[PDB]
Amino acid sequence: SALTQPRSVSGSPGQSVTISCTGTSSDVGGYNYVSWYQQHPGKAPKVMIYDVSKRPSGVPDRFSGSKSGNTASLTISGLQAEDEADYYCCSYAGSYTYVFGTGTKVTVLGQPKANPTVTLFPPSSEELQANKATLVCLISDFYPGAVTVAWKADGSPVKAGVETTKPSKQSNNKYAASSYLSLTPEQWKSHRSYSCQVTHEGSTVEKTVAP
Amino acid sequence: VQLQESGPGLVKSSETLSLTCTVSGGSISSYFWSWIRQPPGKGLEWIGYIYYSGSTNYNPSLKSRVTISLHTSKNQFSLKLSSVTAADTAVYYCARHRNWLFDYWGQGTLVTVSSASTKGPSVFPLAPSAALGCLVKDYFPEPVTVSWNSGALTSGVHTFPAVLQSSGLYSLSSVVTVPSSSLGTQTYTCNVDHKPSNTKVDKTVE
């Protein structure tokens, strides 16, 4: 089980952010072998913190690390543009094994927050005639560039046949994401409704379709 | 220390994935040498590592399918992942492991798992009921380009990155937001170009 981090954190230049990393007594709580890695797009991850709170040479002291029980925390004071990246925690997990966290995007706020436009398209009759059924949830004009998408069938969770893209920057500098629920025409017909539920900055936007 | 992954790029489903990492600036006769991956989908996933002695330890969920070996005559170490499926498409990273951390990483290399051969897309309409679009479904390999009205329509367009489906085929979509009252007066056409299969499609939506 990957270590649990939040999906997104954000703050303005000069300000602070904290990223949690929740494991168990077998990993984060069991040892002081917790490290954190910074990853820019297409670059090698870089160690920023190791053994919970220790900084490699060259890493600024604005990066600090702590731990309480089963949760480790990385704090980035005095945010600068270059701190915008994905961050992963990692722990020793016993018997010569390691487990990484799920990743957090840190955004350094340079434009206004914005909640997503969400459009859910049912499968076309043309696709249905081709004996396939694809629900298409398109998500645009959001900032910061991180979103959680949950699919529902008759209100209950679906996680078979789901594929979601990582947010992409648009020409207007906001972000876009897409999600797909792929199924058969009978499976499409086997529920009264389907919904795409998009969570952004503590707000949900839900669209529903029916055959 | 610099690390460089090398590899096949594309692997057919149910084949063995083999990757090599060549190390420069130091010897693989010290420390541990590891592989980690990232599905376009999730965060990092530790695969395993090899100690300079040849001793290995693997992620319990991958262990039955994984071998990591040393090739000291070339300062290299390798990964073999057996019988890959769609769930193994990822960027694979090699890294040095030392003192309870991963101190030097390669930049990573994308391995795509698909047994597909070249196939042009089916383009389906995403009709309005104002936003509308085109679903460019089931093509291989990348890439596809999408324009609207042959380039003349741009405001409110976004064409999303492709997903690779468990079929081993890609899909993407493109959406445009238009004024509600334009639907009767004006046609909206997505122009889909898939160079690899020599396929261009023009689909006019509702």
Numbering used by the authors:
A (entry chain B): 2 to 9, 11 to 30, 30A, 30B, 30C, 31 to 95, 95A, 96 to 209
B (entry chain A): 2 to 82, 82A, 82B, 82C, 83 to 127, 136 to 212
The publication says:
Among various ANAs, anti-double-stranded DNA (dsDNA) antibodies are a reliable diagnostic marker for SLE. Among the ANAs we isolated, clones 71F12 and 121G9 were highly reactive to both ds and ssDNA. The surface plasmon resonance (SPR) binding experiments revealed that they bind to oligo dsDNA with nanomolar dissociation constants, which were much smaller than the values of polyreactive 72H11 (equilibrium dissociation constant [KD] = ~400 nM). It should be noted that 71F12 has base specificity, as this clone exclusively bound to the thymine-containing ssDNA and dsDNA.
The ANA 71F12, an anti-DNA antibody belonged to the 6th largest lineage in VH4 sequences. In the anti-DNA 71F12 lineage, a majority of the diverse sequences shared three amino acid mutations, one in HCDR1 (Y33F) and two in the framework regions (P14S and D72H). Among the four 71F12 heavy chain residues that underwent somatic mutation, three (P14S, Y33F, and D72H) were highly prevalent within the lineage. Therefore, both Y33F and D72H somatic mutations contribute significantly to the acquisition of high affinity toward a stretch of DNA containing at least one thymine. Strikingly, 71F12 gained high affinity against thymine-containing nucleotides by mutating just two residues, one of which lies outside the core antigen binding site.
